[PDB]
């Protein structure tokens, strides 16, 4: 019963050596500069995170001239807030609605829109998701706490070339007036997965 | 490739277990690893097609018992010896073969700069479409030995065009150095009856998959 193919399994002993020994090896042929790699850690674990989209999407809750922008472009739309890049160089906004609930996956590897997401939780990555995702999605959702009414569509979307999705979920009621800021706050992550709804205040 | 990675429809994985509180690197080696990618990329190494089929190709077992930053572990020790950028021995050894013989594509002064930028796989000129939005195709049976984006899950379906997202470069042919034969990106739109059978199948349910221009035929 442990982990073993979850992508939460133990990784082998010795594996920060081998990681050591590659990594010394790239910088002695020059290859590699150990500074830059410094900057792309310290940009995926400081900079680029779910915060961003949690803006996309409040920013999409209040402003609907704004929504129609991301709608049309939505390369264009995040790059509005300073949004951009690697693993989103072309982006596809999927709005959920009263009628269609939107999720996606990337069943052949771990595709996923890094600049205004971050990197992928793990599970997000691993087979049990990826598998699953495609042929009973309701089965998976409920793994996570999330029915979707019988009458609603589910509309999965496996990422299979380089366009990125990202969805834009529905804004809970009870939040008239909120700022974005508070909006933006009940935005989570799983939420623009389509994992999960946003926080309902 | 009909490899253990294409898990659309697969049974037996089990329960998305799912960590509380996940950071984003779990251990310090998976920064080392990931840091790494874009840099081997900036030196033009390999394409990221390349990347995805080495991965692909590594042993099944070892592919499902690997944690994710392993796949990527095994392809910088894998890919770059067959890509001719180091040597077998020096990947054992961890010993470099004669010094210093290269220059980092990827500096601080431009990390900023090309993670902003990236590199699109859009092109402006390819295939013309075939196909317009609300067209019936069907994906055809292929089975290439080498890298493809059409999931086993898909292959015979029939569903419904619902974007056209204009011309991208194709994998299956920039991923064995025949070039980039671009091409119409389409994303089409199957029943999950037509995908799955009477039996496992949601009435409601769609399941939308981006293909590439000819790996469809009129259905
Ligand atoms: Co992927």
Same mark, same amino acid.
């Given at each position: 019963?442990?982990?073993?193919?979850?992508?939460?399994?133990?990784?082998?002993?010795?594996?920060? /050596?081998?990681? %050591?020994? +590659?990594?010394?090896?790239?910088?002695?042929?020059?290859?590699?500069?150990?500074?830059?790699?410094?900057?792309?850690?310290?940009?995926?674990?400081? %900079?680029?995170?779910?915060?961003?989209?949690?803006?996309?999407?409040?920013?999409?809750? &209040?402003?609907?001239?704004?929504?129609?922008? /991301? +709608?049309?472009?939505?390369?264009?739309?995040?790059?509005?807030?300073?949004?951009?890049? &690697?693993?989103?160089?072309?982006? &596809?906004?999927?709005?959920?609605?009263?009628?269609?609930?939107?999720?996606?996956?990337?069943?052949?590897?771990?595709?996923?829109?890094?600049?205004? /997401?971050?990197?992928?939780?793990?599970?997000? %990555?691993?087979?049990?998701?990826?598998?699953?995702?495609?042929?009973?999605?309701?089965?998976?959702?409920?793994?996570?706490? +999330?029915?979707?009414?019988?009458? %609603?569509?589910?509309?999965?979307?496996?990422?299979?070339?380089?366009?990125?999705?990202?969805?834009?979920?529905?804004?809970?009621?009870?939040?008239?007036?909120?700022?974005?800021?508070?909006?933006?706050? +009940?935005?989570?992550?799983?939420?623009?997965?389509?994992?999960?709804?946003?926080?309902?205040? | 490739?009909?490899?253990?990675?294409?898990?659309?429809?697969?049974?037996?994985?089990?329960?998305?277990?799912?960590?509380?509180?996940?950071?984003?690197? @779990?251990?310090?080696?998976?920064?080392?690893?990931?840091? $790494?990618?874009?840099?081997?990329?900036?030196?033009?190494?390999?394409? $990221?097609?390349?990347?995805?089929?080495?991965?692909?190709?590594?042993?099944?077992?070892?592919?499902?018992?690997?944690?994710?930053?392993?796949?990527?572990? *095994?392809?910088?020790?894998? $890919?770059?010896?067959?890509?001719?950028?180091?040597?077998?021995?020096?990947?054992?050894?961890?010993?470099?073969?004669?010094?210093?013989?290269?220059?980092?594509? $990827?500096?601080?002064?431009?990390?900023?700069?090309?993670?902003?930028?990236?590199?699109?796989?859009?092109?402006?000129?390819?295939?013309?479409?075939?196909?317009?939005?609300?067209?019936?195709?069907?994906?055809?049976?292929?089975?290439?030995?080498?890298?493809?984006?059409?999931? @086993?899950?898909?292959?015979?379906?029939?569903?419904?065009?619902?974007?056209? *997202?204009?011309?991208?470069?194709?994998?299956?042919?920039?991923?064995?150095?025949?070039?980039?034969?671009?091409?119409?990106?389409?994303?089409?739109?199957?029943?999950?009856?037509?995908?799955?059978?009477?039996?496992?199948?949601?009435?409601?349910?769609?399941?939308?998959?981006?293909?590439?221009?000819?790996?469809?035929?009129?259905?």
């Amino acid at each position: 019963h442990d982990h073993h193919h979850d992508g939460y399994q133990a990784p082998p002993e010795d594996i920060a /050596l081998r990681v %050591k020994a +590659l990594e010394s090896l790239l910088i002695e042929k020059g290859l590699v500069d150990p500074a830059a790699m410094d900057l792309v850690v310290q940009t995926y674990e400081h %900079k680029v995170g779910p915060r961003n989209g949690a803006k996309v999407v409040a920013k999409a809750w &209040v402003d609907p001239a704004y929504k129609a922008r /991301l +709608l049309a472009d939505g390369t264009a739309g995040i790059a509005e807030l300073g949004f951009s890049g &690697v693993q989103g160089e072309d982006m &596809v906004i999927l709005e959920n609605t009263p009628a269609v609930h939107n999720v996606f996956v990337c069943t052949l590897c771990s595709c996923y829109p890094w600049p205004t /997401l971050g990197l992928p939780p793990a599970w997000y %990555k691993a087979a049990p998701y990826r598998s699953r995702m495609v042929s009973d999605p309701r089965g998976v959702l409920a793994e996570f706490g +999330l029915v979707i009414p019988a009458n %609603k569509e589910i509309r999965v979307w496996d990422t299979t070339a380089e366009l990125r999705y990202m969805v834009l979920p529905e804004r809970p009621a009870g939040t008239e007036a909120y700022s974005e800021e508070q909006l933006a706050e +009940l935005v989570t992550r799983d939420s623009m997965i389509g994992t999960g709804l946003p926080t309902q205040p | 490739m009909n490899g253990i990675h294409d898990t659309g429809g697969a049974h037996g994985y089990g329960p998305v277990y799912r960590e509380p509180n996940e950071p984003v690197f @779990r251990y310090d080696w998976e920064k080392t690893v990931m840091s $790494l990618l874009p840099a081997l990329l900036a030196n033009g190494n390999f394409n $990221l097609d390349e990347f995805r089929h080495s991965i692909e190709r590594m042993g099944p077992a070892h592919y499902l018992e690997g944690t994710y930053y392993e796949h990527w572990l *095994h392809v910088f020790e894998n $890919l770059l010896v067959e890509k001719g950028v180091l040597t077998a021995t020096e990947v054992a050894t961890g010993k470099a073969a004669s010094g210093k013989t290269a220059t980092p594509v $990827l500096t601080p002064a431009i990390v900023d700069g090309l993670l902003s930028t990236g590199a699109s796989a859009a092109r402006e000129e390819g295939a013309r479409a075939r196909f317009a939005v609300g067209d019936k195709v069907r994906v055809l049976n292929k089975n290439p030995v080498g890298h493809t984006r059409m999931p @086993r899950y898909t292959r015979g379906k029939v569903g419904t065009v619902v974007i056209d *997202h204009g011309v991208f470069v194709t994998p299956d042919t920039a991923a064995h150095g025949k070039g980039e034969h671009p091409q119409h990106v389409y994303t089409v739109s199957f029943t999950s009856v037509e995908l799955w059978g009477q039996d496992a199948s949601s009435p409601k349910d769609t399941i939308r998959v981006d293909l590439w221009d000819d790996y469809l035929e009129p259905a």
